[PDB]
Design an enzyme around this catalytic site. Structure first.
Site, mmCIF file in Angstrom:
data_model
loop_
_atom_site.group_PDB
_atom_site.id
_atom_site.type_symbol
_atom_site.label_atom_id
_atom_site.label_comp_id
_atom_site.label_asym_id
_atom_site.label_seq_id
_atom_site.Cartn_x
_atom_site.Cartn_y
_atom_site.Cartn_z
ATOM 1 N N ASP A 114 0.826 -1.199 0.000
ATOM 2 C CA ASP A 114 0.000 0.000 0.000
ATOM 3 C C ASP A 114 0.864 1.254 0.000
ATOM 4 O O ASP A 114 1.902 1.314 0.662
ATOM 5 C CB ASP A 114 -0.926 0.000 1.217
ATOM 6 C CG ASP A 114 -1.711 -1.286 1.353
ATOM 7 O OD1 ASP A 114 -1.289 -2.302 0.762
ATOM 8 O OD2 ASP A 114 -2.744 -1.287 2.052
ATOM 9 N N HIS B 173 -1.033 4.686 -0.326
ATOM 10 C CA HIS B 173 -1.926 5.654 0.312
ATOM 11 C C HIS B 173 -1.493 7.092 0.027
ATOM 12 O O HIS B 173 -1.478 7.952 0.909
ATOM 13 C CB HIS B 173 -2.022 5.394 1.816
ATOM 14 C CG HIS B 173 -2.907 4.242 2.174
ATOM 15 N ND1 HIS B 173 -4.233 4.178 1.801
ATOM 16 C CD2 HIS B 173 -2.656 3.105 2.866
ATOM 17 C CE1 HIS B 173 -4.761 3.053 2.250
ATOM 18 N NE2 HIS B 173 -3.825 2.384 2.900
ATOM 19 N N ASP C 126 -4.574 0.123 -2.964
ATOM 20 C CA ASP C 126 -4.532 1.212 -1.988
ATOM 21 C C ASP C 126 -3.548 2.300 -2.420
ATOM 22 O O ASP C 126 -2.616 2.665 -1.701
ATOM 23 C CB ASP C 126 -4.198 0.683 -0.590
ATOM 24 C CG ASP C 126 -5.401 0.074 0.104
ATOM 25 O OD1 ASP C 126 -6.472 -0.016 -0.533
ATOM 26 O OD2 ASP C 126 -5.279 -0.311 1.285
ATOM 27 N N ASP D 61 -6.133 7.828 -0.906
ATOM 28 C CA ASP D 61 -6.642 8.040 0.448
ATOM 29 C C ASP D 61 -5.517 8.153 1.470
ATOM 30 O O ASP D 61 -4.455 7.543 1.309
ATOM 31 C CB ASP D 61 -7.613 6.924 0.850
ATOM 32 C CG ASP D 61 -8.843 6.875 -0.035
ATOM 33 O OD1 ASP D 61 -9.251 7.936 -0.547
ATOM 34 O OD2 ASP D 61 -9.400 5.772 -0.218
ATOM 35 N N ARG D 62 -5.750 8.935 2.525
ATOM 36 C CA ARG D 62 -4.784 9.169 3.597
ATOM 37 C C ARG D 62 -3.443 9.675 3.076
ATOM 38 O O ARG D 62 -2.387 9.269 3.572
ATOM 39 C CB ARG D 62 -4.580 7.907 4.445
ATOM 40 C CG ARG D 62 -5.875 7.268 4.921
ATOM 41 C CD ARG D 62 -5.610 6.176 5.944
ATOM 42 N NE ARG D 62 -5.106 6.713 7.202
ATOM 43 C CZ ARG D 62 -5.633 6.454 8.390
ATOM 44 N NH1 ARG D 62 -6.689 5.667 8.522
ATOM 45 N NH2 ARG D 62 -5.087 6.999 9.475
ATOM 46 N N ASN E 275 -9.143 -2.164 -1.375
ATOM 47 C CA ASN E 275 -10.366 -1.766 -0.689
ATOM 48 C C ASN E 275 -10.568 -0.256 -0.687
ATOM 49 O O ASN E 275 -11.714 0.201 -0.624
ATOM 50 C CB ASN E 275 -10.361 -2.292 0.748
ATOM 51 C CG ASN E 275 -9.359 -1.572 1.628
ATOM 52 O OD1 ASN E 275 -8.157 -1.589 1.363
ATOM 53 N ND2 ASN E 275 -9.850 -0.935 2.684
ATOM 54 N N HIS E 276 -9.490 0.525 -0.754
ATOM 55 C CA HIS E 276 -9.602 1.978 -0.735
ATOM 56 C C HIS E 276 -9.949 2.568 -2.095
ATOM 57 O O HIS E 276 -10.249 3.765 -2.171
ATOM 58 C CB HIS E 276 -8.300 2.601 -0.224
ATOM 59 C CG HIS E 276 -8.213 2.681 1.268
ATOM 60 N ND1 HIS E 276 -8.343 3.867 1.957
ATOM 61 C CD2 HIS E 276 -8.010 1.723 2.202
ATOM 62 C CE1 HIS E 276 -8.223 3.636 3.253
ATOM 63 N NE2 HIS E 276 -8.022 2.342 3.429
ATOM 64 N N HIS F 77 -5.099 -8.418 -2.274
ATOM 65 C CA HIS F 77 -5.011 -7.291 -1.351
ATOM 66 C C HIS F 77 -5.444 -7.696 0.055
ATOM 67 O O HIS F 77 -4.657 -7.620 1.006
ATOM 68 C CB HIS F 77 -5.857 -6.125 -1.864
ATOM 69 C CG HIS F 77 -5.714 -4.876 -1.053
ATOM 70 N ND1 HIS F 77 -4.531 -4.174 -0.972
ATOM 71 C CD2 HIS F 77 -6.603 -4.203 -0.285
ATOM 72 C CE1 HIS F 77 -4.696 -3.123 -0.190
ATOM 73 N NE2 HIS F 77 -5.945 -3.117 0.240
ATOM 74 N N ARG G 188 -12.746 -4.423 11.919
ATOM 75 C CA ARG G 188 -12.956 -3.586 10.744
ATOM 76 C C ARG G 188 -14.432 -3.430 10.406
ATOM 77 O O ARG G 188 -14.817 -2.438 9.778
ATOM 78 C CB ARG G 188 -12.210 -4.163 9.540
ATOM 79 C CG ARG G 188 -10.696 -4.086 9.636
ATOM 80 C CD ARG G 188 -10.048 -4.524 8.331
ATOM 81 N NE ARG G 188 -8.596 -4.594 8.432
ATOM 82 C CZ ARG G 188 -7.782 -3.566 8.231
ATOM 83 N NH1 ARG G 188 -8.245 -2.368 7.919
ATOM 84 N NH2 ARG G 188 -6.469 -3.747 8.349
ATOM 85 N N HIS H 84 -2.345 -5.073 3.661
ATOM 86 C CA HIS H 84 -3.561 -4.434 4.081
ATOM 87 C C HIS H 84 -3.349 -3.898 5.436
ATOM 88 O O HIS H 84 -3.788 -2.813 5.757
ATOM 89 C CB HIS H 84 -4.706 -5.427 4.145
ATOM 90 C CG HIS H 84 -5.987 -4.806 3.777
ATOM 91 N ND1 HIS H 84 -6.961 -4.440 4.681
ATOM 92 C CD2 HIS H 84 -6.422 -4.418 2.571
ATOM 93 C CE1 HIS H 84 -7.934 -3.838 4.022
ATOM 94 N NE2 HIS H 84 -7.544 -3.681 2.772
ATOM 95 N N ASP I 98 3.796 -22.859 -22.463
ATOM 96 C CA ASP I 98 4.270 -23.341 -21.170
ATOM 97 C C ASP I 98 3.123 -23.356 -20.167
ATOM 98 O O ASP I 98 2.989 -22.438 -19.353
ATOM 99 C CB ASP I 98 5.426 -22.473 -20.667
ATOM 100 C CG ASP I 98 6.221 -23.141 -19.564
ATOM 101 O OD1 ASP I 98 6.365 -24.382 -19.599
ATOM 102 O OD2 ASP I 98 6.717 -22.423 -18.671
ATOM 103 N N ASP J 170 2.332 -25.326 -17.509
ATOM 104 C CA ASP J 170 2.618 -25.500 -16.091
ATOM 105 C C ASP J 170 3.564 -24.446 -15.531
ATOM 106 O O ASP J 170 3.838 -24.461 -14.326
ATOM 107 C CB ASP J 170 3.183 -26.906 -15.827
ATOM 108 C CG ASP J 170 4.521 -27.157 -16.519
ATOM 109 O OD1 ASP J 170 5.145 -26.207 -17.037
ATOM 110 O OD2 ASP J 170 4.953 -28.327 -16.543
ATOM 111 N N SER K 162 6.596 -24.302 -15.618
ATOM 112 C CA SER K 162 7.870 -24.863 -15.189
ATOM 113 C C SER K 162 8.977 -24.440 -16.146
ATOM 114 O O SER K 162 8.713 -24.091 -17.302
ATOM 115 C CB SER K 162 7.783 -26.387 -15.114
ATOM 116 O OG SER K 162 9.012 -26.948 -14.685
ATOM 117 N N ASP L 66 14.968 -28.686 -29.010
ATOM 118 C CA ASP L 66 15.988 -28.976 -28.011
ATOM 119 C C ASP L 66 17.360 -28.979 -28.676
ATOM 120 O O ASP L 66 17.581 -29.701 -29.655
ATOM 121 C CB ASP L 66 15.707 -30.320 -27.341
ATOM 122 C CG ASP L 66 16.694 -30.640 -26.232
ATOM 123 O OD1 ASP L 66 17.456 -29.737 -25.828
ATOM 124 O OD2 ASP L 66 16.710 -31.798 -25.767
HETATM 125 CA CA LIG Z 1 7.145 -26.639 -18.534
HETATM 126 CA CA LIG Z 2 17.609 -28.093 -23.450
HETATM 127 FE FE LIG Z 3 -4.599 0.271 3.281
HETATM 128 ZN ZN LIG Z 4 -6.346 -2.006 2.398
#
Ligand SMILES: [Ca+2]
Ligand SMILES: [Ca+2]
Ligand SMILES: [Fe+3]
Ligand SMILES: [Zn+2]
Ligand SMILES: [Ca+2]
Ligand SMILES: [Ca+2]
Ligand SMILES: [Ca+2]
Ligand SMILES: [Ca+2]
Ligand SMILES: [Ca+2]
Ligand SMILES: [Ca+2]
Ligand SMILES: [Ca+2]
Ligand SMILES: [Ca+2]
Ligand SMILES: [Ca+2]
Ligand SMILES: [Ca+2]
Ligand SMILES: [Fe+3]
Ligand SMILES: [Zn+2]
Lengths: 587, 149, 587, 149
Positions: free
Chosen positions: C140, C142, C169, C172-173, C201-202, C253, C315, C342, C521, C523, C525, C561
């Site tokens: 954040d 702010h 965020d 604000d403030r 949230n802000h 967040h 809150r 947060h 790609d 996955d 990886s 390859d």
């Molecule tokens: Ca892979």
């Molecule tokens: Ca290779």
């Molecule tokens: Fe905040």
């Molecule tokens: Zn927040």
């Protein structure tokens, strides 16, 4: 033993000392003046009717557009004039866990009437304890109906002798905020002269959206939520900003700042600020920063121990004020202390700034079960706070009972009458047996009144006092046996408690001259002031052409004093006027 | 001896001493402690008071003046003092021993301690002291109501 | 001494051990694959062009309505295509304490472009570190422009090799929330592939009214505040909900709950919820509670140490989730850990739930001076958090400097080329002197390229690489003396730092096939997977009628390859395609 | 002797012992401590190491094995241990004695301690350690950067 017995005895005696110091002063606040004024009413009429001849001249002188909801509405008829039975019906309806939804038309009617009545009120409501001799101040509720019910059960229903002060935050963070708001508005409408409402920081549409009050309204009333919110907006707009107790104690929700001035606040138009965080600017003009800053400070400020004034960083709104700011505020506004509410306390109350600042919180279990306790303040005629702590429970809320309680002022006038009428009890019974040879115990109203008037010549309207001096009497005959029991046993007289006979005593003495005395009591000090009398004369002689001569005002002002101490009590003024009118109508 | 105390505490301790020393001669007698025990509704009599007035005296004579009273209470406050007096007060308030001070025991105390309260006043005091809504004053509520006001 | 020297030595050595464990792994993440792929690019082309003959077939294949403000606007031209110079101009304009107001038309243009670009983005933005090998996450702000400037100075400007993640965020403030928002939108527009923004949230109109952001906008722009707020509303509506790092780490967040599901979130229409606390319901239909609850939970939740899930009482919004809820969430969504922001922390970071939850906060002095420090997270290719703490100051903000820094990937390819070209440095200089008999040090571009191509036959597009291998070269002649110095002194090669020559290296290899590799790609990886290859083939053979035969896909997948380990790195794929295209265009 | 420690701390203490015991014979020699001092950039030589290897030995012989090392460090950790090692590390890092570790001293340490970092890497490490923006590492920042990562 040794230590244990002696220490326990001294501790109990120390508690006893404070208990007596409170009790004797509480009874002295009434009895020593009440006895003198009763002696005046019974004897000084003889001196009064001599000067009555010279003082004859001046002393006696839009629309419904709602829609039907689903199958969850219960039948509870509500009419425009709110009375006690409506209050009990609403309490019983809201108390039910299932099936507690009243018809939308009644909610709309209540909201419209509350807004209309609050529109006429000024920015700051003045409160005086001349009649009640006591006052109750409550903190934040946040929709906790159980806390409100507990307070009402413990302290009794609001009445002219038991005024109630609420310091805002009636909604948000609660499952029954709408019910709490409706109950508060109903109590205010039923008792306009005994219920005072102050606006808080949570009474905002932006705050309602932030904390989900609008979602609660939508869930409760899926069809008419928009109209209900629109009506609630007017109530939020017209809520008073604060109240002042006897021109000495100021009650505000958030607090004040170094630039906070009550003179500017008393001139602020409440209608413009429907919402505080997001002003509407409907008039088409730029927002006045100076006027909005006063409301923002008095709504969002919090106290701090550190000296100086800095903006409230933790809340993001309002400022922190130290003891020096509080001292400067009290000096400038000539106040004694300040009661506020906004921050939650474990005990429900806390003293700050060497006891110049008092914080009160009424919502128990604000964060979690057992997190904090709720409390309320009881203040006497001398304005000494008394804190009573309570914890609400869901199971016990169905076993509570509510009553209007017995007034303090009435508790002395009847007792002194019963005590001083004992000297003629035998003659009263003898005359009753003369009018009732069979000693059946029942004689007609006229016969009974004539009998006790002949035995004790007082000339009071005994027919109205029949409801007090003869409980259970019929419309044809009066049970004088109970009247004799009142002289023989004070228990029967004291067992009246709450009853419909209160208006009979309110008719005597306590006319609109009660409010007239508060009007003429500028400094709010007890038993008026001669300076107040001359100040009132100085403008009452020339304010309108129909005004009377100054010499006429001086004589009546000197006559209003009965015991001769140079001051005129409220009840002394009422008794003097009552005796004057009684002699005028009897001569 | 009395150096451990200050005038602020002595202001209340002189009232505490005069609570027993009612005759004003400057020293507590046996009858003076007996009348306090009777006012508090306590049983002990000469068989205990005669030994008490010499054991808590620390001087060796059958009466207790202000310095002698201050001495023993000073020895008390130097040690742990808070809990025991409160427990003894709750015990003497709780005649039945059930741990909850009801209206009857409180009324008996007040009429024995010196008041003439009616039923309504006792009920009001009970309902003000009853924080949790049970209807009887427990130990925590008793402590709160004693330390408050 | 005794204890002191030995303990200091062992403590320093323990710190050294962690330092080396980080450094060697960081350099190994690149160099050992880069050397092999460079050897492939320089030699395996000989084996590649043999099969090139069989694989020729498929391997190469509204409007302005603003008004003029008062006399406080400074001149700063901004055009539709955002570039680096616009970023520096905006940074310099906002940095000034007095006279930092740009024209309303530029603000409107920036907001409109940001909203239009954010409209096309999905609910969750996938982030991969294949190219950058690093990622930065910020908490954040702010409205703290000083913290953002400090972070930009410490870590450098955003770029394709230095991606930035912001967790909401932004407003604000803060006294400079509008400037922070404008700077973030400008950076996002300038670097769409390197800046990721998450909604907080802000970022709410109700929140702005609660914290006074609308008042700040009105004060900054008294004439056009309404239009600016209306434009900001669209940006708030179109902000993405969150991002996922390499399909392993989720960045949100607020957090999650027991019923929170990412599948439902990925289907939520962001356009409907312009405001979270007060939904507009413009479509004329009742609010869907189930869909709104997911957003509310992921925006307002906070972690707790206690087991189980309970609503957030402190809150008033969101719920508290314990370690069991976090474990269930990670198991269900197959994630490793979660980064959130947060709640403010004294050190700017905190580990919770046996390190399954990481909280990051970037705003320093959130409540008061010295209350807390700001921090940001640096993560490598293996996603190990690294926290750097900072404290911002108003006086030092004018002395900061910003640069785009030097990429990690480029730091290895140039170094290995310089190291391996040392074997022919003498022959290169001899041929340069043959083409430059006077040894003046300057020869034409064609002559230089031909000379070093004849000395080292590689066939690379040396004309584009001229900007890297010869700094300060002219459009007519190339300074080969600096080229020889690169082989003789690595300091000259390393001193390039930030420069415009980066695009020359980006043209080679790093085509849109970089994004193609991330697409294939699945996955996420490293160096792809044979299972991914066959899965891609199984739908690429029959997805459209123009698809190639399966046997053609198998041969090209086996050819991608180069080193023969059975896997294909991103840079390996790029190098294989580059060599194929080079031989195709040269034959 | 070693009962006061647990396997969790012994896991790091064996690495700490092997830091000096590089030859692997199982006991620290004088040359082994001398090469560690030289690697850390420390002055002391035979005139101090000969007395050290017997005074911090607690056995009476000119070499330090694992139990003897563990014994003295156990006596250390039982007492207050945290502050002094950190102060000594900051002092040896801060060659100039001004209380702020600049780039030059850090570079000298790293090249003497075993690294071959360039100017840019040292500048990056300084700017990461410089929390307050001064440009030099003070005591608090040094402690934070040492206890972090
Ligand atoms: Ca892979
Ligand atoms: Ca290779
Ligand atoms: Fe905040
Ligand atoms: Zn927040
Ligand atoms: Ca007066
Ligand atoms: Ca009088
Ligand atoms: Ca005596
Ligand atoms: Ca004695
Ligand atoms: Ca009992
Ligand atoms: Ca109880
Ligand atoms: Ca050895
Ligand atoms: Ca040894
Ligand atoms: Ca230094
Ligand atoms: Ca520093
Ligand atoms: Fe509140
Ligand atoms: Zn409040």
């Amino acid at each position: 033993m040794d230590e244990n017995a002696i220490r326990a005895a001294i501790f109990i005696q120390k508690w006893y000392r404070r208990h007596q110091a409170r009790r004797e002063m509480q009874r002295r606040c009434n009895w020593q003046i009440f006895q003198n004024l009763e002696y005046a009413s019974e004897q000084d009429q003889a001196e009064l009717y001599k000067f009555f001849n010279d003082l004859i001249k001046h002393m006696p002188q839009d629309k419904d557009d709602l829609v039907e909801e689903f199958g969850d509405i219960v039948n509870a008829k509500i009419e425009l004039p709110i009375r006690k039975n409506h209050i009990d019906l609403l309490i019983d309806v809201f108390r039910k866990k299932r099936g507690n939804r009243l018809h939308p038309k009644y909610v709309a009617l209540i909201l419209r009437e509350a807004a209309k009545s609050l529109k006429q009120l000024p920015n700051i409501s003045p409160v005086s304890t001349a009649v009640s001799q006591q006052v109750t101040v409550c903190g934040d509720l946040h929709g906790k109906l159980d806390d409100l019910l507990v307070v009402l059960h413990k302290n009794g229903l609001p009445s002219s002798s038991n005024p109630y002060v609420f310091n805002g935050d009636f909604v948000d963070r609660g499952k029954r905020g709408l019910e709490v708001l409706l109950l508060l508005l109903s109590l205010y409408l039923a008792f306009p002269n005994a219920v005072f409402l102050n606006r808080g920081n949570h009474e905002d549409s932006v705050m309602n959206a932030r904390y989900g009050f609008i979602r609660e309204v939508e869930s409760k009333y899926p069809r008419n939520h928009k109209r209900i919110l629109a009506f609630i907006d007017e109530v939020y707009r017209w809520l008073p900003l604060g109240s002042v107790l006897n021109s000495r104690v100021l009650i505000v929700h958030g607090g004040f700042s170094d630039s906070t001035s009550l003179d500017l606040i008393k001139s602020i138009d409440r209608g413009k600020y429907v919402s505080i965080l997001r002003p509407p600017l409907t008039d088409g003009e730029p927002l006045d920063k100076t006027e909005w800053q006063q409301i923002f400070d008095i709504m969002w400020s919090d106290p701090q121990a550190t000296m100086g004034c800095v903006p409230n960083t933790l809340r993001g709104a309002g400022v922190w004020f130290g003891p020096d700011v509080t001292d400067n505020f009290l000096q400038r506004h000539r106040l004694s202390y300040v009661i506020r509410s906004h921050e939650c306390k474990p005990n429900g109350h806390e003293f700050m700034h060497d006891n110049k600042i008092i914080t009160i919180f009424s919502a128990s279990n604000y964060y979690a079960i057992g997190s904090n306790k709720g409390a309320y303040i009881r203040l006497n005629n001398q304005l000494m706070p008394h804190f009573v702590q309570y914890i609400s429970a869901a199971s016990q809320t169905k076993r509570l009972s509510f009553k209007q309680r017995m007034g303090i002022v009435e508790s002395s006038a009847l007792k002194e009458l019963a005590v001083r009428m004992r000297d003629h009890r035998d003659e009263l019974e003898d005359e009753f047996r003369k009018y009732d040879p069979k000693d059946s115990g029942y004689i007609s109203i006229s016969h009974w009144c004539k009998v006790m008037e002949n035995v004790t010549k007082l000339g009071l309207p005994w027919r109205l006092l029949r409801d007090k001096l003869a409980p259970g009497t019929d419309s044809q005959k009066v049970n004088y046996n109970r009247t004799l029991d009142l002289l023989d046993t004070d228990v029967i007289l004291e067992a009246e408690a709450d009853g419909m006979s209160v208006m009979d005593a309110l008719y005597a003495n306590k006319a609109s001259l009660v409010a007239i005395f508060n009007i003429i009591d500028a400094d709010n000090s007890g038993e008026i002031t001669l300076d107040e009398f001359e100040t009132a004369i100085d403008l009452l002689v020339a304010h309108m052409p129909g005004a009377y001569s100054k010499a006429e005002m001086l004589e009546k002002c000197r006559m209003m004093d009965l015991n001769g101490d140079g001051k005129v009590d409220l009840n002394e003024f009422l008794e003097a006027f009552r005796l004057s009118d009684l002699h005028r109508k009897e001569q | 001896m009395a150096d451990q105390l200050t005038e602020e505490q002595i202001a209340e301790f002189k009232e505490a001493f005069s609570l027993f020393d009612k005759d004003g001669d400057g020293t507590i007698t046996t009858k003076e402690l007996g009348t306090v025990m009777r006012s508090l509704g306590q049983n002990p009599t000469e068989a205990e008071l005669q030994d008490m007035i010499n054991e808590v005296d620390a001087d060796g004579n059958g009466t207790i003046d202000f310095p002698e009273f201050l001495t023993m209470m000073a020895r008390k406050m130097k040690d742990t003092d808070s809990e025991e007096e409160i427990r003894e007060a709750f015990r003497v308030f709780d005649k039945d021993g059930n741990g909850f001070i009801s209206a009857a025991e409180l009324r008996h105390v007040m009429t024995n301690l010196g008041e003439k309260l009616t039923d309504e006043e006792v009920d009001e005091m009970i309902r003000e002291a009853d924080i949790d809504g049970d209807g009887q004053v427990n130990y925590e509520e008793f402590v709160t109501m004693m330390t408050s006001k």
